[PDB]
PDB file of C-alpha atoms and ligand atoms in Angstrom:
ATOM      1  CA  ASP A 937    -190.750 -52.723-106.603  1.00 18.49           C
ATOM      2  CA  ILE A 938    -187.052 -52.924-106.051  1.00 14.45           C
ATOM      3  CA  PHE A 939    -187.447 -55.245-103.254  1.00 12.46           C
ATOM      4  CA  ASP A 940    -189.725 -57.527-104.903  1.00 12.67           C
ATOM      5  CA  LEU A 941    -187.408 -57.949-107.866  1.00 12.84           C
ATOM      6  CA  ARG A 942    -184.558 -58.982-105.027  1.00 14.72           C
ATOM      7  CA  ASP A 943    -186.760 -61.195-103.237  1.00 15.98           C
ATOM      8  CA  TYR A 944    -187.517 -63.152-106.460  1.00 16.50           C
ATOM      9  CA  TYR A 945    -183.810 -63.735-107.313  1.00 14.30           C
ATOM     10  CA  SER A 946    -183.001 -64.420-103.365  1.00 15.17           C
ATOM     11  CA  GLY A 947    -185.552 -67.037-103.470  1.00 16.90           C
ATOM     12  CA  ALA A 948    -185.659 -70.682-104.045  1.00 14.05           C
ATOM     13  CA  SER A 949    -184.922 -72.722-107.325  1.00 14.02           C
ATOM     14  CA  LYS A 950    -184.374 -76.188-107.990  1.00 11.84           C
ATOM     15  CA  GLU A 951    -182.905 -78.183-110.951  1.00 11.75           C
ATOM     16  CA  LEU A 952    -184.809 -81.363-112.102  1.00 12.40           C
ATOM     17  CA  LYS A 953    -182.680 -84.063-113.958  1.00 11.25           C
ATOM     18  CA  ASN A 954    -183.717 -86.571-116.723  1.00  7.02           C
ATOM     19  CA  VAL A 955    -187.373 -85.996-116.505  1.00 11.62           C
ATOM     20  CA  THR A 956    -190.176 -86.544-119.113  1.00 13.76           C
ATOM     21  CA  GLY A 957    -192.205 -83.699-120.474  1.00 14.54           C
ATOM     22  CA  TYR A 958    -195.523 -84.100-122.075  1.00 13.05           C
ATOM     23  CA  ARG A 959    -196.426 -81.332-124.575  1.00 15.38           C
ATOM     24  CA  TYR A 960    -199.650 -79.494-124.981  1.00 17.68           C
ATOM     25  CA  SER A 961    -201.426 -76.194-125.657  1.00 19.37           C
ATOM     26  CA  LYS A 962    -204.117 -74.309-124.394  1.00 17.87           C
ATOM     27  CA  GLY A 963    -205.308 -70.642-125.280  1.00 19.36           C
ATOM     28  CA  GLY A 964    -202.556 -70.176-127.813  1.00 20.84           C
ATOM     29  CA  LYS A 965    -200.160 -70.818-124.942  1.00 20.81           C
ATOM     30  CA  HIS A 966    -197.707 -73.773-125.006  1.00 20.07           C
ATOM     31  CA  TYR A 967    -196.693 -76.010-121.966  1.00 18.27           C
ATOM     32  CA  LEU A 968    -194.998 -79.017-120.876  1.00 18.32           C
ATOM     33  CA  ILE A 969    -196.289 -80.950-117.839  1.00 17.53           C
ATOM     34  CA  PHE A 970    -194.461 -83.606-115.866  1.00 20.76           C
ATOM     35  CA  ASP A 971    -195.322 -85.450-112.796  1.00 18.20           C
ATOM     36  CA  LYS A 972    -193.185 -86.882-109.688  1.00 17.41           C
ATOM     37  CA  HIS A 973    -194.495 -87.938-106.408  1.00 13.95           C
ATOM     38  CA  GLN A 974    -198.192 -87.920-107.713  1.00 16.25           C
ATOM     39  CA  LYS A 975    -197.831 -84.146-108.220  1.00 16.62           C
ATOM     40  CA  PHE A 976    -197.664 -81.984-111.421  1.00 14.53           C
ATOM     41  CA  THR A 977    -195.367 -79.447-112.435  1.00 17.20           C
ATOM     42  CA  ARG A 978    -196.391 -77.164-115.568  1.00 14.22           C
ATOM     43  CA  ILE A 979    -193.991 -75.254-117.290  1.00 11.50           C
ATOM     44  CA  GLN A 980    -194.736 -72.675-120.023  1.00 10.33           C
ATOM     45  CA  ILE A 981    -192.544 -72.703-123.309  1.00 12.87           C
ATOM     46  CA  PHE A 982    -191.747 -69.579-125.280  1.00 12.84           C
ATOM     47  CA  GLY A 983    -190.109 -68.696-128.457  1.00 13.71           C
ATOM     48  CA  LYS A 984    -188.565 -71.136-130.874  1.00 14.81           C
ATOM     49  CA  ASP A 985    -188.557 -73.868-128.002  1.00 13.06           C
ATOM     50  CA  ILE A 986    -191.925 -74.254-128.808  1.00 13.76           C
ATOM     51  CA  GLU A 987    -191.071 -76.467-131.913  1.00 15.39           C
ATOM     52  CA  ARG A 988    -187.976 -78.144-130.671  1.00 16.52           C
ATOM     53  CA  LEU A 989    -190.415 -79.753-128.698  1.00 17.84           C
ATOM     54  CA  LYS A 990    -192.785 -80.891-131.430  1.00 16.29           C
ATOM     55  CA  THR A 991    -193.565 -84.129-129.981  1.00 17.60           C
ATOM     56  CA  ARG A 992    -196.211 -85.409-127.512  1.00 21.46           C
ATOM     57  CA  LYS A 993    -193.539 -87.197-125.303  1.00 22.84           C
ATOM     58  CA  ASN A 994    -190.042 -85.644-124.406  1.00 25.65           C
ATOM     59  CA  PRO A 995    -187.494 -87.605-122.475  1.00 22.94           C
ATOM     60  CA  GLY A 996    -184.333 -86.824-120.910  1.00 27.44           C
ATOM     61  CA  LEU A 997    -185.000 -83.429-120.039  1.00 27.58           C
ATOM     62  CA  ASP A 998    -183.548 -80.977-117.422  1.00 27.35           C
ATOM     63  CA  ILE A 999    -185.759 -78.091-115.969  1.00 27.74           C
ATOM     64  CA  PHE A1000    -184.858 -74.720-114.030  1.00 27.56           C
ATOM     65  CA  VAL A1001    -187.667 -74.661-112.070  1.00 25.79           C
ATOM     66  CA  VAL A1002    -188.648 -71.178-110.117  1.00 25.05           C
ATOM     67  CA  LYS A1003    -192.091 -71.192-108.790  1.00 27.73           C
ATOM     68  CA  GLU A1004    -194.200 -68.425-110.112  1.00 30.66           C
ATOM     69  CA  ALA A1005    -197.433 -69.922-109.056  1.00 30.66           C
ATOM     70  CA  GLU A1006    -198.906 -72.893-107.267  1.00 31.78           C
ATOM     71  CA  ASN A1007    -202.494 -73.838-106.846  1.00 30.29           C
ATOM     72  CA  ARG A1008    -204.524 -75.916-104.227  1.00 27.95           C
ATOM     73  CA  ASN A1009    -203.684 -79.410-105.996  1.00 28.19           C
ATOM     74  CA  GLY A1010    -200.164 -78.205-105.227  1.00 28.06           C
ATOM     75  CA  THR A1011    -199.337 -78.050-109.141  1.00 27.60           C
ATOM     76  CA  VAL A1012    -196.502 -75.603-109.483  1.00 26.14           C
ATOM     77  CA  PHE A1013    -196.120 -73.332-112.355  1.00 23.05           C
ATOM     78  CA  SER A1014    -193.062 -72.156-113.676  1.00 25.38           C
ATOM     79  CA  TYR A1015    -191.581 -70.138-116.994  1.00 22.16           C
ATOM     80  CA  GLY A1016    -189.095 -71.694-119.272  1.00 24.06           C
ATOM     81  CA  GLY A1017    -185.978 -73.312-118.215  1.00 23.12           C
ATOM     82  CA  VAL A1018    -185.900 -76.554-120.447  1.00 28.02           C
ATOM     83  CA  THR A1019    -182.835 -78.076-121.757  1.00 27.73           C
ATOM     84  CA  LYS A1020    -181.667 -81.556-122.729  1.00 23.79           C
ATOM     85  CA  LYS A1021    -179.763 -83.668-120.232  1.00 25.56           C
ATOM     86  CA  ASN A1022    -176.014 -83.977-120.986  1.00 21.42           C
ATOM     87  CA  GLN A1023    -174.927 -86.516-123.735  1.00 19.37           C
ATOM     88  CA  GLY A1024    -171.603 -86.882-121.954  1.00 20.79           C
ATOM     89  CA  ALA A1025    -170.847 -87.708-118.463  1.00 20.42           C
ATOM     90  CA  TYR A1026    -168.518 -85.536-116.360  1.00 17.68           C
ATOM     91  CA  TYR A1027    -166.578 -85.645-113.168  1.00 13.90           C
ATOM     92  CA  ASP A1028    -166.465 -82.071-112.742  1.00 16.55           C
ATOM     93  CA  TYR A1029    -167.187 -78.998-114.414  1.00 16.67           C
ATOM     94  CA  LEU A1030    -166.949 -78.410-118.051  1.00 11.64           C
ATOM     95  CA  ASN A1031    -166.319 -74.723-118.303  1.00 12.45           C
ATOM     96  CA  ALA A1032    -165.071 -71.930-115.795  1.00 11.63           C
ATOM     97  CA  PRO A1033    -165.383 -68.690-117.600  1.00 11.78           C
ATOM     98  CA  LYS A1034    -164.268 -65.827-115.656  1.00 12.51           C
ATOM     99  CA  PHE A1035    -167.043 -63.605-114.088  1.00 12.30           C
ATOM    100  CA  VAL A1036    -165.621 -59.864-114.225  1.00 11.53           C
ATOM    101  CA  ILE A1037    -167.581 -57.775-111.819  1.00 11.81           C
ATOM    102  CA  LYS A1038    -167.405 -54.135-111.962  1.00 14.35           C
ATOM    103  CA  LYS A1039    -168.487 -52.843-108.339  1.00 12.90           C
ATOM    104  CA  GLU A1040    -169.084 -48.935-107.731  1.00 12.85           C
ATOM    105  CA  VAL A1041    -167.515 -48.129-104.868  1.00 10.75           C
ATOM    106  CA  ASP A1042    -166.590 -44.776-103.021  1.00 10.07           C
ATOM    107  CA  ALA A1043    -164.469 -42.848-105.725  1.00 12.15           C
ATOM    108  CA  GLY A1044    -164.585 -45.232-108.035  1.00 12.12           C
ATOM    109  CA  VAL A1045    -165.032 -48.653-109.773  1.00 12.73           C
ATOM    110  CA  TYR A1046    -163.645 -51.929-108.218  1.00 11.34           C
ATOM    111  CA  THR A1047    -162.939 -55.076-110.506  1.00 11.61           C
ATOM    112  CA  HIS A1048    -163.286 -58.601-109.036  1.00 11.49           C
ATOM    113  CA  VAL A1049    -162.847 -61.552-110.840  1.00 13.39           C
ATOM    114  CA  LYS A1050    -164.454 -64.680-109.940  1.00 11.79           C
ATOM    115  CA  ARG A1051    -165.420 -67.960-111.845  1.00 13.35           C
ATOM    116  CA  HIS A1052    -168.488 -69.527-112.760  1.00 12.97           C
ATOM    117  CA  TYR A1053    -168.919 -73.030-113.222  1.00 14.84           C
ATOM    118  CA  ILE A1054    -170.858 -74.508-115.701  1.00 15.43           C
ATOM    119  CA  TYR A1055    -171.815 -78.099-115.503  1.00 14.93           C
ATOM    120  CA  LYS A1056    -174.129 -78.637-118.497  1.00 13.09           C
ATOM    121  CA  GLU A1057    -173.762 -78.626-122.142  1.00 13.53           C
ATOM    122  CA  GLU A1058    -176.888 -76.811-122.802  1.00 13.43           C
ATOM    123  CA  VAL A1059    -177.605 -73.919-120.900  1.00 12.69           C
ATOM    124  CA  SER A1060    -180.695 -71.803-120.211  1.00 13.02           C
ATOM    125  CA  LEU A1061    -180.519 -68.165-120.243  1.00 14.45           C
ATOM    126  CA  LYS A1062    -183.137 -68.614-117.362  1.00 11.77           C
ATOM    127  CA  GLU A1063    -180.699 -70.403-115.126  1.00 13.92           C
ATOM    128  CA  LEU A1064    -177.704 -68.260-115.894  1.00 11.92           C
ATOM    129  CA  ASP A1065    -179.565 -64.857-115.277  1.00 13.54           C
ATOM    130  CA  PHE A1066    -180.945 -66.371-111.953  1.00 17.43           C
ATOM    131  CA  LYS A1067    -177.857 -67.936-110.570  1.00 19.08           C
ATOM    132  CA  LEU A1068    -175.778 -65.192-111.624  1.00 19.78           C
ATOM    133  CA  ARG A1069    -178.046 -62.501-109.959  1.00 18.26           C
ATOM    134  CA  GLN A1070    -178.582 -64.755-106.793  1.00 17.88           C
ATOM    135  CA  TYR A1071    -174.735 -64.935-106.335  1.00 21.86           C
ATOM    136  CA  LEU A1072    -174.486 -61.010-106.856  1.00 22.40           C
ATOM    137  CA  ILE A1073    -177.150 -60.289-103.918  1.00 23.20           C
ATOM    138  CA  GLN A1074    -175.409 -62.550-101.758  1.00 25.45           C
ATOM    139  CA  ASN A1075    -172.087 -61.188-102.120  1.00 24.47           C
ATOM    140  CA  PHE A1076    -171.994 -57.985-104.126  1.00 22.85           C
ATOM    141  CA  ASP A1077    -174.767 -55.924-102.780  1.00 22.01           C
ATOM    142  CA  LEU A1078    -177.002 -56.266-105.759  1.00 23.67           C
ATOM    143  CA  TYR A1079    -180.295 -54.035-105.053  1.00 22.60           C
ATOM    144  CA  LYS A1080    -178.946 -52.463-101.836  1.00 22.82           C
ATOM    145  CA  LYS A1081    -178.831 -49.332-104.161  1.00 23.00           C
ATOM    146  CA  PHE A1082    -181.243 -48.640-107.140  1.00 21.12           C
ATOM    147  CA  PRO A1083    -179.525 -50.492-110.254  1.00 18.26           C
ATOM    148  CA  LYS A1084    -180.191 -47.901-113.086  1.00 16.85           C
ATOM    149  CA  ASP A1085    -178.488 -49.205-116.037  1.00 18.60           C
ATOM    150  CA  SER A1086    -176.408 -52.114-114.394  1.00 17.85           C
ATOM    151  CA  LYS A1087    -176.412 -55.338-116.789  1.00 18.91           C
ATOM    152  CA  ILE A1088    -174.896 -58.623-116.901  1.00 17.88           C
ATOM    153  CA  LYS A1089    -173.399 -59.613-120.388  1.00 19.91           C
ATOM    154  CA  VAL A1090    -172.612 -63.143-121.355  1.00 18.88           C
ATOM    155  CA  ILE A1091    -169.919 -63.356-124.355  1.00 17.54           C
ATOM    156  CA  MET A1092    -169.426 -66.275-126.240  1.00 17.50           C
ATOM    157  CA  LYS A1093    -165.993 -67.797-127.767  1.00 14.02           C
ATOM    158  CA  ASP A1094    -167.414 -66.774-131.271  1.00 14.02           C
ATOM    159  CA  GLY A1095    -168.198 -63.002-130.133  1.00 14.12           C
ATOM    160  CA  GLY A1096    -172.034 -63.469-129.970  1.00 14.28           C
ATOM    161  CA  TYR A1097    -173.444 -61.999-126.441  1.00 13.69           C
ATOM    162  CA  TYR A1098    -176.689 -62.025-124.345  1.00 13.71           C
ATOM    163  CA  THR A1099    -177.470 -59.136-121.944  1.00 11.20           C
ATOM    164  CA  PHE A1100    -179.566 -59.225-118.635  1.00 11.33           C
ATOM    165  CA  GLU A1101    -180.758 -55.890-117.529  1.00 12.24           C
ATOM    166  CA  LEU A1102    -180.908 -55.686-113.999  1.00 13.21           C
ATOM    167  CA  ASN A1103    -183.516 -53.360-113.343  1.00 13.87           C
ATOM    168  CA  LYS A1104    -185.943 -55.763-114.122  1.00 14.45           C
ATOM    169  CA  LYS A1105    -187.015 -59.578-114.189  1.00 17.22           C
ATOM    170  CA  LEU A1106    -185.707 -61.490-117.226  1.00 19.64           C
ATOM    171  CA  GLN A1107    -188.440 -61.132-120.007  1.00 21.66           C
ATOM    172  CA  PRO A1108    -190.759 -64.362-119.867  1.00 21.59           C
ATOM    173  CA  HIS A1109    -190.260 -64.725-123.618  1.00 23.69           C
ATOM    174  CA  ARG A1110    -186.623 -65.093-123.345  1.00 26.62           C
ATOM    175  CA  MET A1111    -186.983 -67.523-120.651  1.00 25.29           C
ATOM    176  CA  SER A1112    -186.819 -70.719-122.848  1.00 23.12           C
ATOM    177  CA  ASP A1113    -183.751 -69.692-124.760  1.00 23.32           C
ATOM    178  CA  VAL A1114    -180.627 -71.671-124.655  1.00 24.74           C
ATOM    179  CA  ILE A1115    -177.262 -71.487-125.001  1.00 24.82           C
ATOM    180  CA  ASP A1116    -174.006 -74.234-125.072  1.00 24.35           C
ATOM    181  CA  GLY A1117    -172.390 -74.175-121.937  1.00 24.29           C
ATOM    182  CA  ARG A1118    -168.886 -75.214-123.520  1.00 24.55           C
ATOM    183  CA  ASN A1119    -168.607 -71.873-125.707  1.00 22.13           C
ATOM    184  CA  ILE A1120    -169.304 -69.420-122.997  1.00 22.92           C
ATOM    185  CA  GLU A1121    -166.083 -67.472-122.601  1.00 20.09           C
ATOM    186  CA  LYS A1122    -166.641 -64.960-119.931  1.00 19.14           C
ATOM    187  CA  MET A1123    -169.549 -63.057-118.359  1.00 21.16           C
ATOM    188  CA  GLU A1124    -169.221 -59.507-117.181  1.00 20.06           C
ATOM    189  CA  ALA A1125    -171.364 -57.506-114.684  1.00 17.03           C
ATOM    190  CA  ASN A1126    -171.320 -53.811-114.018  1.00 17.19           C
ATOM    191  CA  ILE A1127    -173.132 -53.157-110.453  1.00 18.10           C
ATOM    192  CA  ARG A1128    -174.240 -50.036-108.575  1.00 14.45           C
TER     193      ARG A1128
HETATM  194  C1  LIG B2545    -191.552 -56.397-124.760  1.00 11.14           C
HETATM  195  C2  LIG B2545    -190.671 -57.413-124.453  1.00 11.14           C
HETATM  196  O1  LIG B2545    -190.504 -58.202-123.374  1.00 11.14           O
HETATM  197  N1  LIG B2545    -189.655 -57.423-125.512  1.00 11.14           N
HETATM  198  C3  LIG B2545    -188.716 -58.398-125.483  1.00 11.14           C
HETATM  199  C4  LIG B2545    -187.309 -57.425-125.993  1.00 11.14           C
HETATM  200  O2  LIG B2545    -186.966 -56.693-125.014  1.00 11.14           O
HETATM  201  C5  LIG B2545    -187.444 -55.260-125.281  1.00 11.14           C
HETATM  202  O3  LIG B2545    -186.769 -54.775-126.502  1.00 11.14           O
HETATM  203  C6  LIG B2545    -185.232 -54.516-125.965  1.00 11.14           C
HETATM  204  C7  LIG B2545    -184.470 -54.215-127.438  1.00 11.14           C
HETATM  205  C8  LIG B2545    -184.894 -53.696-124.792  1.00 11.14           C
HETATM  206  O4  LIG B2545    -185.626 -52.382-125.037  1.00 11.14           O
HETATM  207  C9  LIG B2545    -185.832 -54.237-123.786  1.00 11.14           C
HETATM  208  O5  LIG B2545    -185.761 -53.635-122.303  1.00 11.14           O
HETATM  209  C10 LIG B2545    -187.167 -54.505-124.105  1.00 11.14           C
HETATM  210  O6  LIG B2545    -187.964 -55.471-122.965  1.00 11.14           O
HETATM  211  C11 LIG B2545    -186.025 -58.642-126.316  1.00 11.14           C
HETATM  212  O7  LIG B2545    -185.145 -57.990-126.880  1.00 11.14           O
HETATM  213  C12 LIG B2545    -183.803 -58.326-126.371  1.00 11.14           C
HETATM  214  O8  LIG B2545    -183.644 -57.381-125.052  1.00 11.14           O
HETATM  215  C13 LIG B2545    -182.437 -57.494-124.414  1.00 11.14           C
HETATM  216  C14 LIG B2545    -182.361 -56.463-123.259  1.00 11.14           C
HETATM  217  O9  LIG B2545    -183.494 -56.742-122.298  1.00 11.14           O
HETATM  218  C15 LIG B2545    -181.174 -57.435-125.389  1.00 11.14           C
HETATM  219  O10 LIG B2545    -181.304 -55.846-125.824  1.00 11.14           O
HETATM  220  C16 LIG B2545    -181.409 -58.314-126.797  1.00 11.14           C
HETATM  221  O11 LIG B2545    -180.348 -57.793-127.309  1.00 11.14           O
HETATM  222  C17 LIG B2545    -179.138 -59.198-127.694  1.00 11.14           C
HETATM  223  C18 LIG B2545    -178.816 -59.093-126.295  1.00 11.14           C
HETATM  224  O12 LIG B2545    -177.874 -58.592-125.896  1.00 11.14           O
HETATM  225  O13 LIG B2545    -179.209 -59.920-125.416  1.00 11.14           O
HETATM  226  C19 LIG B2545    -178.369 -58.860-128.633  1.00 11.14           C
HETATM  227  C20 LIG B2545    -177.400 -59.775-128.984  1.00 11.14           C
HETATM  228  O14 LIG B2545    -176.694 -59.656-130.224  1.00 11.14           O
HETATM  229  C21 LIG B2545    -178.452 -61.169-129.118  1.00 11.14           C
HETATM  230  N2  LIG B2545    -177.527 -62.346-129.339  1.00 11.14           N
HETATM  231  C22 LIG B2545    -177.150 -62.993-130.071  1.00 11.14           C
HETATM  232  C23 LIG B2545    -176.202 -64.234-130.116  1.00 11.14           C
HETATM  233  O15 LIG B2545    -177.985 -63.360-130.946  1.00 11.14           O
HETATM  234  C24 LIG B2545    -179.265 -61.510-127.734  1.00 11.14           C
HETATM  235  C25 LIG B2545    -180.140 -62.727-128.003  1.00 11.14           C
HETATM  236  O16 LIG B2545    -180.936 -62.725-129.226  1.00 11.14           O
HETATM  237  C26 LIG B2545    -181.209 -62.447-126.716  1.00 11.14           C
HETATM  238  O17 LIG B2545    -180.245 -62.209-125.603  1.00 11.14           O
HETATM  239  C27 LIG B2545    -181.799 -63.924-126.733  1.00 11.14           C
HETATM  240  O18 LIG B2545    -182.647 -63.902-125.449  1.00 11.14           O
HETATM  241  O19 LIG B2545    -180.044 -60.318-127.761  1.00 11.14           O
HETATM  242  C28 LIG B2545    -182.729 -57.814-127.091  1.00 11.14           C
HETATM  243  O20 LIG B2545    -182.882 -58.605-128.341  1.00 11.14           O
HETATM  244  C29 LIG B2545    -186.652 -59.835-127.094  1.00 11.14           C
HETATM  245  C30 LIG B2545    -185.752 -60.971-127.677  1.00 11.14           C
HETATM  246  O21 LIG B2545    -184.879 -61.505-126.550  1.00 11.14           O
HETATM  247  O22 LIG B2545    -187.725 -60.571-126.552  1.00 11.14           O
HETATM  248  C31 LIG B2545    -189.119 -59.823-126.415  1.00 11.14           C
HETATM  249  O23 LIG B2545    -189.984 -60.387-125.876  1.00 11.14           O
END
């Protein structure tokens, strides 16, 4: 339902920094597990990230967590969103691509130009998708109308791009994909 899609992207998320993930696999699924305050978080890993993490112990990770499920032990489950922590040390954002939002209005389309500040060298598609939708829900009335063919496009300096179709959740198998934050040129959204 459209309201479940909205409530997903309006919900809580957290960025965990410099954590050590332990790799394993069960039933043909691949995971990274970590612990904090005597509690576990299990992250499912997808795509070719499955062998970028090919060692048991993986220090120095950043994880973007969106709770998908939680059990009685309080173990939280989330999909993808694992990146390497920054090698640099920064005092402000490292890139500020324009976010060009074309919003349908009465009798036309109105283009708003915003910035989206990037603080990470390696950024997951999961994090960008989630944060950009949440911003559009809060500020540009995303999901107050049915989204139809609405999309977000992230365009890289070399001309490569990534597309987020707004009529459904980001596909789980894409939630491990990572891009270089320094190389994003611009982002576009067309909103109903
Ligand atoms: C069943 C399923 O979940 N399949 C996933 C693919 O999605 C399915 O097929 C596509 C063609 C659409 O019909 C989807 O609705 C459908 O679920 C998924 O394919 C990717 O889908 C997205 C849109 O959802 C998009 O079309 C992808 O194409 C690009 C893009 O615009 O994002 C094309 C770009 O040139 C390419 N960029 C670069 C630099 O290569 C990107 C990039 O590869 C991906 O964005 C990375 O995630 O893709 C289309 O590939 C497929 C791969 O993401 O995952 C399937 O599990």
